[PDB]
Design a binder for these strands. Structure first.
Lengths: 176, 175, 122
RNA sequence: GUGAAGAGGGAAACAACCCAGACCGCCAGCUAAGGUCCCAAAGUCAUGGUUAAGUGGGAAACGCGGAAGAU
RNA sequence: GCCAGGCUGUCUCCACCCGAGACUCAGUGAAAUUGAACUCGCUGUGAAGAUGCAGUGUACCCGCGGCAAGCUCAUCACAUCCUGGGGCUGAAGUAGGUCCCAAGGGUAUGGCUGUUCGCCAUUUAAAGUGGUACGCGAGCUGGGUUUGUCCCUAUCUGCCGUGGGCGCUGGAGAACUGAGGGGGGCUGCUCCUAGUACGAGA
RNA sequence: GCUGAAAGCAUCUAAGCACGAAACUUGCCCCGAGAUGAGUUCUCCCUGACCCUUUAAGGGUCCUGAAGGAACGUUGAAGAC
């Protein structure tokens, strides 16, 4: 409700098309499409994107707010892109990257290889630091979550894969 | 690479240079002629119907004679199917040698075990039944020796069927 | 080989003369035991200060089998009787430093590296 | 009151549950209980409400829960 | 009247062989029972476990070979003993305590009882609870109780294997896709990771 | 578990929206079109005549007897038959 009443400013270089319920956004990174729920109406609103809940839907306000948030994220992605940083805390944790596959070794007897969805670029400024660039927040988040699931942040040393803007808690045995 | 039908001849132990003689069953695999090709368009699935051996003129029924003439193959004592590996089909009248099994190292042997007489209630249900002469496939058998110029195959262990019994050897799909 | 209530000979200076099997280990609900298998035996007759007293319960291993055992080359080495040497769960090193009769070449196991030294007769 | 000594219809079956006392016959119609999605004959019938859980299609005392039932 | 010893498939496990039956060929051929049988399973009711009443599913018609449901042999629910995962934990890890789910699989040998049950020794991952008239006497010893021939053609229902007739649409010989059904899916040890992560140390 | 409120925080889900237990099923192999829903593929044989009726999924007569099977013998590592 409150979040919905907030048109999102679309910067230059981003093209937005509203084909019925479908929203197609284009920018520097590439094409993006997203079928919007029918419970909210979206108009072009040049330089903005106004959302209006459809009459007859009790969930209209939350749907409109979520759609506005998703469109804002897509606009921010296409215009500049989304970047995520992941650190590998621990001795011997390598983050070799080649092609469209990220290879990791977090104490397993076998390497853990994760496939990179199209449109996602992986870079290694440092061997223990891995940076993902992607136009869509969902894809980069999913790949980062898949990488993190291989080795959970160990809650005794805070090892494994961690996000740059995430706080990792750790603890030690009380007395024994 | 693809299944071949052969005939059991005997089983022995092949003495290795290191004194590790292995039980080997001997299969004579004559060049099996691909009588027909079953494709998706006509037969609904990929496979080849093949034969081998020779049939007596009296033993060959005229329908079978025409079938072989269309296939362009010598009348073999039996016909069998072989499902392809979705790689490619074979041509009518093609004879398949044993070189395909020369580089497999793992095969499965399907055959009919030696027949046994009346299996009473105690032997079957512990009504009566019977044992033997049943087509079963023993899996995970590694070929020991292959001789293409002699059409000789030695396979580890034991296989169903007595001397002269027809059997099939297929790639060891199961591991 | 061994079965239920088997009669085993003795091939060590521990003083045992007649050893009788009681239980079979090396597999749940197992039937028999082999030469390279651990068996459960007790003693029936002991010297005045034999290391084993009647009713003892301790492990053992068969060194010679009346039934005979096979080899990869087809050898079926067999002996006139079943000979067994007692072993302990702790301090596996048997007390007997001398073994009567020859032994086969299957004693190359991890724990049987100290027995191959004994038995000078092959 | 019924059976005993009353047939028949309904309750899926069923003698004590509801309707209903068979002279015989005729390929007609109207009712009693019970039904009108079908099996199986009839409204997938009109209006005012409860039901989101197949509770209907089994359950007390007690603060919708209580609720666990037979190859 | 008791003890010690040698002594055999009584058994682990039974494997083969020798003579008569069990099966067929040619002939003799009686029985107990019989109202008539076009004699299925499951759920529910019924003078109370239904081949015959209400609902539902399967099954071409008729023969030959018997274990017998009418100690051996098993079947079904989890309301779980284990294999077990998952929440909580007074869970640092192994190891555990409570609870939710899981029946796919397993769920002993001896000494006292006739014993179900019950006590003790030895192992495993456990040596589970109940229904089937503690399931099973026209299957088996009667051990106590409760007529020690443990009686009554295995006549007929159900049961697997294999046959004779018939249709797949003119007939016939071959190779098969496959709707569906069946079987089992267990588990110990060592080696590199590694005396490694973690862990103040252990 | 990536963004994430409604309910300026938070949250497994309300919108976008991902892995995963030996628990279940395919996958391992056997029987299986009596599966009456009676299935798919290959090959082979028959290419005559006449008469009558209640005139049509009709009947009868002479000739013909194809492929295949069974009939019988040797018999089998096939079988009680």
């Amino acid at each position: 409700s409150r979040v919905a009443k907030a048109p999102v400013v679309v910067p230059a270089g981003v093209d937005v098309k509203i084909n019925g319920q479908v929203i197609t956004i284009k920018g520097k990174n590439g094409e993006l499409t997203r079928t919007l729920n029918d419970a909210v109406e979206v108009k072009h609103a040049d330089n903005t994107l106004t959302f209006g809940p459809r009459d007859g839907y009790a969930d209209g306000w939350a749907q409109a707010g979520t759609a506005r948030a998703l469109l804002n994220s897509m606009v921010i992605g296409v215009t500049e892109g989304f970047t995520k940083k992941l650190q590998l805390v621990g001795v011997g944790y390598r983050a070799a990257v080649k092609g469209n596959v990220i290879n990791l070794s977090l104490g397993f007897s076998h390497p853990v290889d994760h496939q990179l969805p199209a449109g996602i670029t992986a870079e290694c400024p440092t061997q223990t630091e891995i940076v993902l660039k992607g136009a869509d927040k969902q894809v980069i988040g999913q790949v980062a979550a898949d990488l993190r699931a291989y080795r959970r942040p160990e809650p005794y040393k805070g090892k494994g894969v961690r996000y740059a803007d995430e706080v990792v808690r750790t603890k030690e045995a009380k007395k024994k | 690479m693809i299944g071949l039908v052969g005939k059991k001849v005997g089983m022995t132990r092949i003495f290795t240079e290191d004194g590790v003689s292995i039980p080997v069953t001997v299969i004579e695999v004559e060049a099996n002629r691909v009588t027909q090709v079953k494709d998706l368009a006509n037969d609904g699935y990929r496979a080849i119907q093949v034969t081998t051996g020779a049939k007596k003129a009296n033993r060959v029924t005229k329908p079978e004679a025409g079938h072989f003439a269309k296939a362009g193959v010598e009348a073999g004592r039996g016909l069998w199917e072989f499902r392809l590996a979705e790689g490619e089909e074979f041509t009518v009248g093609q004879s398949i040698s044993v070189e395909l099994f020369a580089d497999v190292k793992k095969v499965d042997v399907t055959g009919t075990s030696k027949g046994k007489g009346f299996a009473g209630t105690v032997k079957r249900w512990n009504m009566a039944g019977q044992m033997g002469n049943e087509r079963v496939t023993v899996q995970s058998l590694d070929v020991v020796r292959v001789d293409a110029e002699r059409n000789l195959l030695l396979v580890k262990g034991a296989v169903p069927g007595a001397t002269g019994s027809d059997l099939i050897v297929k790639p060891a799909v199961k591991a | 080989m061994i079965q239920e209530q088997t009669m085993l000979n003795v091939a060590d200076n521990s003083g045992a003369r007649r050893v009788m099997c009681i239980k079979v280990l090396g597999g749940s609900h197992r039937r028999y035991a082999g030469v390279g298998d651990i068996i459960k035996i007790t003693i029936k007759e002991a010297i005045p200060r034999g290391k084993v007293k009647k009713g003892d319960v301790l492990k053992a291993v068969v060194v010679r089998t009346k039934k005979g055992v096979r080899r990869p080359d087809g050898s079926v080495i067999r002996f006139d009787g079943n000979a067994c040497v007692l072993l302990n769960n702790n301090s596996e090193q048997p007390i007997g430093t001398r073994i009567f009769g020859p032994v086969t070449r299957e004693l190359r196991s991890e724990k049987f590296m100290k027995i191959i030294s004994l038995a000078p007769e092959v």
